[PDB]
């Protein structure tokens, strides 16, 4: 019956079937309960959408159309929860936040 | 050659959904693929440990919800739990 996919059944963009296959073959459990890839794909899609929206906002404030890893770093480090999630994570070609300590300024 | 899979078309679909004027570079796509794989590994490992602690041999959406409550910080975890519950409800209500 035309073989509609599970992501369109769940109304997602991230693949339910590929996430199910990676959960099955990734040596996590004996069984996968078939609603777990839907939840996983939804959580991954939400986190991707939040990061991409903040990075696109940073690129728009930087007057750039395209997102570079600097925009991803500026999106992640300016958010407390995103920086808590990726505290031990290095983003390549992302740089650092502009931050000079207040004592080092003149006068 | 050998067909290596990624999340590039999926992240691009999400990007064109939330920003239908804004492109992305190859390096930023590599960052996004690494992010999705890392968070997948973290949530799946926490759900695997949660299933192993309670003498369960399956991973259900309850294990994934509890893992999302564990790794993710507060409002991030709350909105991710809302998104996952909405998706599982839509998947169950529609075959």
């Amino acid at each position, epitope marked *: 019956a035309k073989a509609k996919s599970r992501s369109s059944r769940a109304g997602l963009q991230f693949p339910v079937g590929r996430v199910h296959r990676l959960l099955r073959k990734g040596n996590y459990a004996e069984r996968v309960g078939a609603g777990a890839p839907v939840y996983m794909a939804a959580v991954l899609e939400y986190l991707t959408a*939040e990061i991409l*929206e*903040l990075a696109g906002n940073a690129a728009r404030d930087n007057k750039k159309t395209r997102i570079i890893p600097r925009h991803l770093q500026l999106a992640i480090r*300016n*958010d*407390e*929860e995103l920086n808590k999630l990726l505290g031990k994570v290095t983003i390549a070609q992302g740089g650092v*936040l502009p931050n000079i300590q207040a004592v080092l300024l003149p006068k | 050659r050998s067909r290596k899979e990624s999340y590039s078309i999926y992240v691009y679909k999400v990007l064109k959904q*939330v920003h239908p004027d804004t492109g992305i570079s190859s390096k930023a796509m590599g960052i996004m693929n690494s992010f999705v794989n890392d968070i997948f590994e973290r949530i799946a490992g926490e759900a695997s440990r949660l299933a192993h602690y309670n003498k369960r041999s399956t991973i259900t959406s309850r294990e994934i919800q509890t893992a999302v409550r564990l790794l993710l*910080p*507060g*409002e*991030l975890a709350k*909105h991710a739990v*809302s998104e996952g519950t909405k998706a599982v409800t839509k998947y169950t209500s529609s075959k």
Partner: single-chain antibody
Amino acid sequence: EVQLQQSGPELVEPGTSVKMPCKASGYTFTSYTIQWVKQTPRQGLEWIGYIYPYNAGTKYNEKFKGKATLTSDKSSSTVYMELSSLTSEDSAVYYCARKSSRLRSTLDYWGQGTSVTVSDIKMTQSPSSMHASLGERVTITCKASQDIRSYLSWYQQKPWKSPKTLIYYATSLADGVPSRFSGSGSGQDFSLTINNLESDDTATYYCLQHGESPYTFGSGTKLEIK
């Protein structure tokens, strides 16, 4: 748990400056922005700006740029608001509200508001004022001038009280709000539905967009029962 303590009313002479405290408790203070909303009976609610205590990040409305100054003090968990060069049109109630840095999140918990007396995208709400019975259905429209990605919230305000968050993300219910209220719509067309009425529902209902950089409230509907 979560509360935003605000000071009493101010009787200020014009041309001076006034400080406003927003002492906060019950949550991790640095992880949530504090927004400031001004409320006059002639222009309704107007979003002024916000402070992020994580990086002390400011953002102001264009009509309040320079006139308003936001500061944060993380030691006492306090947010300060400065108004300088007080024009006679400053007699208004000022609320400070908590809002997470997540885009889906809204102004969930509000302060009591300080009454100060001097001595973009436009939300169109179709019913200005309507009458409903004790068990009728209420439908309120919030037609938007531009497009927003479902970033609309519905608030209920009693007379002489702080607004109460009903609906966030245009469909999701707030914490503690009963399931009688139901939000619907997306894009430019939104609606709030009250299922069955009580005597509590005599209030003014507003819709706020936060999909773009200037946040805009709606005109508001006055709903009174019997």
